[PDB]
């Protein structure tokens, strides 16, 4: 009976993962647009924040690549509040 | 935060109990023990090696996990049987 | 005869070891016997913990399907028929 | 290495995860996969002293991806200047940074 | 120590270095080092006497600190780059720490004040291994990483070993401690040549081994671990002298023997690389090693010391311990200078 | 006789039954009739933070439906 | 050393779905095939080019398709679909075991009408 | 609850410092247990649940237990307590003051290197698979059973030999 | 990360001092060794989980097992010493200097 | 809310531990043919509070003196947190490993008490009991490491959905015959209560704390059995029914402990360690290998969500 039940559990798992599969694309695009808006806002603010200083740049890619770069939560939520920074870091790690 | 709350609560409750307790009224060696502690270690280390099966099993190299498990268990049992035969589990001095 | 006598003795003197060794033998041996073993690897290969990135059609590959629900791909029906 | 018994037998026991971008179990790629994949490809076919000077444009970027000293400092200076401004009384953080927004 | 235990420990000792070398991962290297350490300690402490236990404590403590230091180095390299191996882009402090640790693990100076005590507490058939199958893996680690080392401190360490080992050997009578100091000096020579050409360290090590092992066989013979207990060799067994004298002069490095060749080609490399000053220091301070080898040659062969009567009761007996490889290595040490090019 | 232990058996029974139903009903009162979601992985946590962001109230016990 | 390009907040502003995870997880299966060409093409774009700032025009199409899908599901067979997600979201992990005989009904309705 | 990791780190520092300022072993073992606890909590805050619990289960339950066992059964805290603990306590205080002022000095010269204090909370997690299952250290530690088998067999041999070594020693 | 990491390295250095300087005992030294090992295991697991690397995680397990066995043999030696002298002091080991 | 739930989790369990002391006295009396307490109150429902007041009335290194009992009791109480009844207070993957850790720790208290008390007499029994506890916790852990392969996750919720159809005792009973015994050693209960059998330093208050934690651990190990090897009925509409059946089976096991304490003699230490090392460890290893092979020569390889 344990075997005949474990196999059914595997089937249910396949069902759930197929659902997740079908939904991944949408989520990927939402997440992409969201982080892009985030960076655009960081930039629109950085402009006025650090325009009054000498030989400073605007969105200066610290690399010499031209390759896209997964941004850090540090960069994204670095100007928002501890509330969001922690709801990001210690979210899954502090029991929901 | 939740476990912090629970643990602080438990500690403070115990300390309230003990403070109540305190306010309301007003050698040679035995080699066998060290050998046993050592066996306990050399088994906890096996446990650390052996716990991850519930995730090592869902992989594809069953012919590898099955084997390595059998290997660990059997060689540990061999060491155990040798310790026995050489009288590490007798307690008579 | 000596083997039989030794086991007829152990089966009253010290069975624990008999049970242990028999279990050990059964474990080492049955996997080589049973037919329902490979199915485990087949399953755990089927289980998609990740996304199946697709490909283009700049060639004449006829195996891969242009749609999920189409039949031209690798099937696993034996899973439910199990 | 020293004693190429492994290469002789055409096998591998440890050297298949000697670095970061090896084959991780469930395809979960690491942080600086691409930068490693470029550093190694530039440091292949050649040996040592060639790479220690003709791969810097491919290794400094990698070390940064891995540590991000320069990004840390960038953000640090930004926040220091912002704090000084909000002290002197010239800035006024808008909502999207100040505590709310209309998210997705 | 029953046979199963003996075999398993010998296996682990023969393994530790094999892994430490054949593995390209620093963690596996450190592992092999720990293997050697563990599997060896017992062979030191078998007699279970206080001296053996003390030596075991010293050995274990020092080598533990060393292994943990090397582990710190590896982990810092990980954080820095990501790879478990050393590259040409590691902050030199990590290399310097690795080198301090490898030294303390070998016996180099000034990390060397634990080798004589231990080698005096030990018997012969384990001091031999301690000196000739534990200084290999720690040297393979360097063979792998010689380019990017700190020649400055490497040379300071080597020459310091030369001086201190020689100055201690001038005095120590106990032949075990003498051999230990000789090991210190020769390993100093190696580390001195290392970052220029490693094959030469390989050669110096093999030669020091081929000279040491047979000496320790000749000692294991009688358990004569003192000058006034080895001088009686001309009355116990008058045959080993014609080879012991040669082997000790060799260890000294006299030209017509082979022990010279290493120092010779090493000086050659250091002159090509403009290190003639330290080369001169090494060459002018190996003479004290030569001295306190000559002073034992004297005691044994060139002059006969007072014997002890019961040696007659001994001579009435016989002895067939001294296997063939002893003589084989003695010869292939002393009389093989004509084959130096075929050695390089 | 043996029917004098019930005044301790039932006591322990009720005082071991209380925590379970307590937890259940309390989680339900908080999260609005539905039990407390769980996140063994980052997937479910992403779902929960998404629902939080779109709740319009910044709390995840709100399922919207099709009227958004 | 070098500027970075970025799009603008005022663009890439499409009206998202804003629907809940329970509903998405319930309707997924059908949306696995319906609206699959677009999603697969988008994932292919994202895996070929690592430039989200170049893989955007394939996201608005995705969301438009998903919305034109939920629109048909709103027109036909709405209540079976509402009771469904209200039955799912009750559980913790939102599994497809505690709702079987509330699922085949919705399925047969969706079929007999589509 | 942003200073979390820095606090746990300072406490591990202080535990190792109380072990380096060798006190009476009975009041050093507590420092060690605290050190292990706090280090595991740091690991957990980073996300290595399996590793932290493995520590709690093996280090403390396996090693510190036997350390205390052996110590008690084979040691006597002779009256070396000429206020040695009460002295090294003030010495520890002086050292911790030194360290506090040392960090308050460093933060001036180094700002985005050694430590970023104004934005300390940042720079713990750098990226993460938001939609990804199977990303916990359980998988890495399970590796040994499919790939990297050398680790498992080597540890097995280390124990297989440590048994013989210990027994042959004790006699 | 960098702050806690520098602090862990400091703790390693402190255990180093504890081992390289004595106070007339041996268990203190061995406990400082254990502290070293703990700091190292922690730094390694931190590096791994921060890089999101997985295949490199077996290393902490390996070195932890090896440190367990190492400290075990060290304790065995301490015990033999105490049982052949009368205590676990350090100044009793004045031998071997001859 | 959360404080309310923690109160619901802590107060009733202390109440139950007190009345469990009571139930022990009563059942032992009824098996020895006597009544038991029937006087202080109706059928003896006040003797526990009487004992509490008396103990706290009794007069008597402060560091160890306090941290030991406090530590033990806090561990015993925290052990309850992650349990499903049916939906838990704290859902933790690796919950049972957290359990094992927090159960093993109390050895530190047992050992500090001895190292404080200079009495060689005390260190004697302290070492003995510590060693037996250690050695039995080993198997207590291996049993789980050999069973949980049926649900490829160290969680404690998955147990329930697993046992939905069947229990976990019809298989694995070669283990339950052990997990129902080691629990009699870690608890230092009978027939392994020698730690309280051979006496030749616990004051009133700390004794009360030690005993509180002892009986708490009793209740908790029995609950763990009732959850692992005696799967209840998880019909999602009836968490009340789940909790109720769980209560029943926990009481049954907690009375089985007492059947035992009354009937059997005590084990001589050497015979006990022999029992373990030469009867349970070989069987345990072999059965673990058996349950490792089962999901390979059978399709029953379970999932990890
Ligand atoms: C003495 C009591 C001993 C307590 C031992 C508890 C250790 C932590 C248990 C654990 O490993 O789980 C921690 C928790 C789980 O996180 P994770 O496994 O990643 O997934 C969970 C999904 N909700 O994720 C967490 O990190 C929860 C927060 C961790 C804080 C634990 C505090 C432990 C007690 C501190 C006592 C202070 C004095
Ligand atoms: C595929 C499956 C393979 C087949 C497996 C068959 C079943 C395996 C059985 C596994 C359980 C084995 C337990 C066991 O072997 O206990 C033996 C033990 C005697 O051991 P020993 O110390 O050597 O003394 C005997 C001297 N004549 O006996 C004892 O003395 C233990 C005493 C226990 C005292 C506590 C009694 C509690 C009773 C509760 C019963 C449960 C309810």
Coordinates of C-alpha atoms and ligand atoms in Angstrom, one line a residue, chain A residues 92-96, chain B residues 1 3-4 7-8 11, chain F residues 39-41, chain H residues 4 37 40-41 44-45 47 49-50 52-53 56 136, chain J residues 71 74-75 78 91-94 98 102 105, ligand 1:
Chain A
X92 CA 11.3 33.0 3.6
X93 CA 13.8 32.6 6.5
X94 CA 11.5 33.9 9.3
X95 CA 8.6 31.5 8.8
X96 CA 6.4 33.4 6.5
Chain B
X1 CA 10.4 36.8 15.5
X3 CA 10.6 31.5 17.8
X4 CA 12.3 34.4 19.6
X7 CA 11.9 31.0 23.6
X8 CA 12.0 34.2 25.6
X11 CA 12.9 31.1 29.7
Chain F
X39 CA 6.4 28.2 2.2
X40 CA 8.7 25.3 2.1
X41 CA 10.3 27.0 -0.9
Chain H
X4 CA 21.2 40.8 13.3
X37 CA 24.8 28.5 19.0
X40 CA 24.5 28.3 13.7
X41 CA 22.0 31.1 14.0
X44 CA 20.4 30.0 9.5
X45 CA 19.8 33.7 8.9
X47 CA 19.6 30.3 4.8
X49 CA 18.7 25.5 7.6
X50 CA 20.1 22.0 7.1
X52 CA 22.5 24.9 11.1
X53 CA 20.5 21.9 12.4
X56 CA 23.1 21.7 16.6
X136 CA 18.5 24.4 -0.3
Chain J
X71 CA 17.7 25.0 30.4
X74 CA 12.9 25.5 28.3
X75 CA 14.0 22.8 26.0
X78 CA 10.1 24.4 23.1
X91 CA 5.7 24.6 10.4
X92 CA 9.4 23.8 10.2
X93 CA 11.0 21.5 7.7
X94 CA 13.7 19.7 9.7
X98 CA 15.2 20.4 15.8
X102 CA 16.6 20.1 21.9
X105 CA 20.9 19.1 25.0
Ligands
LIG1 C1 17.3 26.4 22.9 C2 16.2 26.2 21.8 C3 16.9 25.7 20.5 C4 16.1 26.2 19.3 C5 16.6 25.6 18.1 C6 15.9 26.1 16.9 C7 16.9 26.3 15.7 C8 16.2 26.8 14.5 C9 15.3 25.7 13.9 C10 15.4 25.8 12.4 O1 16.3 25.2 11.8 O2 14.4 26.4 11.7 C11 14.6 27.8 11.5 C12 13.6 28.4 10.5 C13 13.4 27.4 9.4 O3 13.8 28.1 8.2 P1 13.8 27.1 6.8 O4 14.3 25.7 7.2 O5 14.8 27.7 5.8 O6 12.3 27.1 6.1 C14 11.3 27.4 7.0 C15 10.0 27.8 6.1 N1 9.1 28.5 6.9 O7 14.1 29.6 10.0 C16 14.6 30.5 11.0 O8 15.7 30.9 10.9 C17 13.7 30.9 12.2 C18 14.4 32.0 13.0 C19 15.7 31.4 13.6 C20 15.8 31.9 15.1 C21 16.0 30.6 15.9 C22 16.2 31.1 17.4 C23 16.6 29.9 18.2 C24 16.5 30.2 19.7 C25 17.4 31.4 20.0 C26 17.6 31.5 21.6 C27 18.2 32.8 21.9 C28 18.6 32.8 23.4

